[PDB]
Enzyme design. Sequence first.
Site, PDB file in Angstrom:
ATOM      1  N   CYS A   1      -4.864  -0.559 -12.532  1.00 10.17           N
ATOM      2  CA  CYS A   1      -4.680   0.926 -12.367  1.00 10.17           C
ATOM      3  C   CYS A   1      -3.501   1.422 -13.148  1.00 10.17           C
ATOM      4  O   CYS A   1      -2.592   0.570 -13.360  1.00 10.17           O
ATOM      5  CB  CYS A   1      -4.838   1.274 -11.031  1.00 10.17           C
ATOM      6  SG  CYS A   1      -3.048   1.136  -9.995  1.00 10.17           S
TER       7      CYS A   1
ATOM      8  N   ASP B   1     -18.273   3.262   2.664  1.00 13.19           N
ATOM      9  CA  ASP B   1     -17.126   4.560   2.939  1.00 13.19           C
ATOM     10  C   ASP B   1     -15.999   3.997   3.846  1.00 13.19           C
ATOM     11  O   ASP B   1     -16.548   3.497   4.972  1.00 13.19           O
ATOM     12  CB  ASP B   1     -17.719   5.732   3.168  1.00 13.19           C
ATOM     13  CG  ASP B   1     -17.961   6.002   4.625  1.00 13.19           C
ATOM     14  OD1 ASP B   1     -19.023   5.592   5.281  1.00 13.19           O
ATOM     15  OD2 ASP B   1     -16.914   6.486   5.245  1.00 13.19           O
TER      16      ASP B   1
ATOM     17  N   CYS C   1      -0.139   0.744 -11.629  1.00 18.33           N
ATOM     18  CA  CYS C   1       0.437  -0.680 -11.960  1.00 18.33           C
ATOM     19  C   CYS C   1       0.874  -0.863 -13.358  1.00 18.33           C
ATOM     20  O   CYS C   1       1.727  -1.811 -13.450  1.00 18.33           O
ATOM     21  CB  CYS C   1      -0.622  -1.570 -11.342  1.00 18.33           C
ATOM     22  SG  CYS C   1      -0.701  -1.576  -9.425  1.00 18.33           S
TER      23      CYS C   1
ATOM     24  N   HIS D   1      -3.600   3.814  -6.360  1.00 26.13           N
ATOM     25  CA  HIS D   1      -3.671   2.243  -6.415  1.00 26.13           C
ATOM     26  C   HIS D   1      -4.707   1.818  -5.371  1.00 26.13           C
ATOM     27  O   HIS D   1      -5.427   0.932  -5.856  1.00 26.13           O
ATOM     28  CB  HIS D   1      -2.230   1.598  -6.198  1.00 26.13           C
ATOM     29  CG  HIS D   1      -2.519   0.199  -5.934  1.00 26.13           C
ATOM     30  ND1 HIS D   1      -2.887  -0.731  -6.824  1.00 26.13           N
ATOM     31  CD2 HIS D   1      -2.557  -0.457  -4.819  1.00 26.13           C
ATOM     32  CE1 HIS D   1      -2.942  -1.721  -6.514  1.00 26.13           C
ATOM     33  NE2 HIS D   1      -2.768  -1.917  -4.942  1.00 26.13           N
TER      34      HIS D   1
HETATM   35 ZN   LIG Z   1      -2.810  -0.787  -9.000  1.00 21.71          ZN
END
Ligand SMILES: [Zn+2]
Lengths: 364, 364
Positions: free
Chosen positions: B301, B261, B304, B330
């Site tokens: 993603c 994390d 994008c 993103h």
């Molecule tokens: Zn992306």
Amino acid sequence: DRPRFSFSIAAREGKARTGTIEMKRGVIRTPAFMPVGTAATVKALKPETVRATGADIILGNTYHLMLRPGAERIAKLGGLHSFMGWDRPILTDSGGYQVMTKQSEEGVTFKSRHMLSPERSIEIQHLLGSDIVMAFDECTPYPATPSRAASSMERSMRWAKRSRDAFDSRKEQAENAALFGIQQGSVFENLRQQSADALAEIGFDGYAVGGLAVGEGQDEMFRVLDFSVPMLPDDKPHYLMGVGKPDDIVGAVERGIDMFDCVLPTRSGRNGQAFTWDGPINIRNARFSEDLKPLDSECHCAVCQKWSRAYIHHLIRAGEILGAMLMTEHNIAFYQQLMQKIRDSISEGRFSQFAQDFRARYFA
Amino acid sequence: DRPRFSFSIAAREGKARTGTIEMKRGVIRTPAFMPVGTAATVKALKPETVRATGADIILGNTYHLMLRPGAERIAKLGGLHSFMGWDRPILTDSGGYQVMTKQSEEGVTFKSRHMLSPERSIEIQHLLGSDIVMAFDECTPYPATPSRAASSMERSMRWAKRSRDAFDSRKEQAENAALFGIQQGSVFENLRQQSADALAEIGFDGYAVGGLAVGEGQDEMFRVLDFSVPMLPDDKPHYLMGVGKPDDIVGAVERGIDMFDCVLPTRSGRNGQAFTWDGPINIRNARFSEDLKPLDSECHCAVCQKWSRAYIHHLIRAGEILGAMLMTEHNIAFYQQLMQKIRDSISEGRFSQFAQDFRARYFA
Ligand SMILES: [Zn+2]
Ligand SMILES: O=c1[nH]c(=O)c2nn[nH]c2[nH]1
Ligand SMILES: O=c1[nH]c(=O)c2nn[nH]c2[nH]1
Ligand SMILES: [Zn+2]
């Protein structure tokens, strides 16, 4: 292919109308509310989310965009639609009203320094690629003497003719976009009449009522609308610029307005104000800290299907971006649901009953 | 119904492992990256969007939530999962490390004033309803003398036993959640060994390597991981707390870490830093003002797929919330794609090649 601009009235009730504007990038259901973009974004919302609320068209802020990134840059990047990812209609303001500085018959100069004219405003809106272009007009101070309101209105009408000519000289723009004129004349009936007469003699695709988001109060706004809207061509859309609160919208539709824009649902959402059918609430108030109900228990929006007042209260108190996202989505959805109820009630001949029921509950 | 906690290793390559943790609220694919919630939200993302990036589990911030809204309030509202709208596993930190103030064998006092103990930390995490509960531990300063690192580690081990006992005494918690112990001992091998021995004698569902996000540098972090991870039970997940940059994650997986994390993808996203397979970029830089490529031309993603560097550059420069939303989505998606490539490459016996190829390109 699709029409450039075709306005059809499907139903009337008193002075209220409901219908559609067909444009190449989509249909606009009227009466319509246009969410306001601030800098090529409707604050805190992806375009898909704006559309999910029911919005058919958004307003793009020419004043902001002409400085950064600039109109030429946005055009180089493919136009405002591609740039921000919204493929449906966009209405752009002309920029002159916002920036109002020194003015002349040529245009307006402002601070490093820049000059906006009717021709440059039309060119900027062309480069942005907007679908509804606003004529370049002046900001009239409020209050204004009759003589100052007259001179301002008449300069705006000369600028409206120059806007018409510049728009028509760009054949791609004239073939694909629409041009709206803006009525001015402050609160004076005779000037509003002269302004309407001038705009109709030039000819526009739609007619805005300008200069009524100047803090004059609802009573006076409604008084001016009472005599001003019937001066405009009946067969073209009527756009009340910068208005307003939900009760303003209802009363303005009752007086013949077809289109609205306002920053209130976005701006006040980020600041904790949520619109509900029982009136606005401030979600930051401690009274919501353990309230498991949604923002509005009759709202159909995705926020009200999934999250509580208590959670959104926490987010806004904590300064969290998700708080602004959820508040803004709900507020824009509330405005779109209001317009849908307006459209349905006019179509069904029940708008007077709706307006009465709306006000009784909203102001209970 | 589903298992409380079942860790299975599907494939190994050197010290790296890939597998699954089955829990009642879902499966966690390992090696896993957990987006960090700040105040019951992964900043600027709806839970559906967090899940859309590929995340299986998120980290909830006990330190923040115990003060506002408070654990008792969140429990009254139905628990953290219902409150924030995330129905999959949540790991909570114990709060003691964050708040580090005065300490004693009982616990830690902090500023109006409050006291956290192992028992109170377990109770808070119970009230929140988290799925993976962290033992209550101490923050060791870095650098630390061997003697101070020893006393801190041994207090943490006594606190780990008290955490185990408090967890086991709450039968709903013990039946539905998992408990992880945290290895301490600073950078000293013998203390890391004594800490591992103590934790294994108590017995936990998973073992975290604590105290290595203290600014020591990657070389030293890797040195400590080299001898520390093999001290932990092989058959349980290994969690490196607060790490880290993409290259940190790759090297830590090579040394046997299964869970990570870090606030970096969320925090640096809002500040203009985008992670790409060619290394990080600062989207605020003027060089991106007319760049029509997505943030990363191989990223899968949704950001994008739809928006350019030029647009996101504009949004961040303008201070717009949508800029933070798109950058954060993103960056979390990039981290999840990194973990997916790690998992796939280990499963396919190609992780050494991946790690070499990754570093050559990321640092080109
Ligand atoms: Zn992306
Ligand atoms: O709010 C407003 N925006 C405008 O662009 C405008 N133009 N005239 N009146 C106006 N009011
Ligand atoms: O980043 C960290 N978070 C924690 O909660 C923790 N506990 N020990 N070390 C830690 N490092
Ligand atoms: Zn709603």
